[model samples]
Target: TVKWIEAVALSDILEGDVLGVTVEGKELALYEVEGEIYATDNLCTHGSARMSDGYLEGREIECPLHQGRFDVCTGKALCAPVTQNIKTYPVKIENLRVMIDLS
Candidate 1:
């Protein structure tokens, strides 16, 4: 089944910034890139680092623990120490609020 949960307000996220949100025990990483919204797993596949605490350079986020990189848009592993790709979620904007699909 497909379900969407209200994550955050559109105004809450700024451009070039990543926000961490938790829903139903799931940690999600929300990103505002060039005025668009994207979501991915908050946990880095390489370590116990949170992608929200990492730096966002372009569309890729660098993990703070191991400095591994992943493309936020596609959840592709971009470097060493991160052979596993994080899960990416679908995002929607309704009435200026961010909605994430977990199903």
Candidate 2:
């Protein structure tokens, strides 16, 4: 089971943007979608570049290395060059703090 680990302040993330944070030696990308939140592995499945460093268009997060895109909410790879989905982690916003299931 994953334990809740504090990630960041809710106000630190803005709409249409991704927040990158390191937790328990793992990099995580947290997206703020119209006030709702989604967390995924920061690294893109196709490259070493971070998903948080890429562009955020709607729910799609493009990889900075190879232009690969994945759905921020579900971590679904959109097309070729990135067919494998990045793992998603559970996130909770309590009193404006972002916490994740990190164990």
Candidate 3:
């Protein structure tokens, strides 16, 4: 069985915004792109930068420290200085709330 925790309310996030949340000591990054929600690890794979502080364009997130890029949906490394992929969590919307599956 999978367990889910309430992350945030849908209204708590706006499009083009990136929200950071820590659950059970796990740092997570929530993104609202084109009215869709995606979640991934907040830390950059190649550096000690937070993805929430990075720039978001289209469906890609650019790391602020070394300009590394990652795909929000697949958490794939998309540019130089980033070869390892970050972790991605499953997200679901229920009752206008964003739920995350940490299992």
Clashing pairs in 2: 3-103
Candidate 1 lDDT score at position 39: 96
The pairs that clash in candidate 3 are none
* lDDT agreement with native, every candidate: 0.93, 0.89, 0.91
Q: Which candidate model has the greater lDDT, 2 or 3? A: 3
lDDT of 1: 0.93
- Candidate 3: deviation at residue 15, Å? 0.7
- Cα misplacement distance, residue 32 of candidate 3 (Å): 0.8
Show where candidate 2 strays beyond 4 Å.
none
Q: Name the weakest run of 10 consecutive residues (lDDT summed) in model 2.
A: 58-67
- Could you estimate the TM-score for every candidate? 0.96, 0.94, 0.95
Candidate with top lDDT is 1
lDDT of 2 at 65: 77
- After superposition, the stretches of candidate 1 with alpha carbons farther than 4 Å from their true spots are none
Tens digits of per-residue lDDT for model 1 on 1-103?
6698999988999889999999879999999888889999999997789999999988999988887999999999999989999999999999989999999
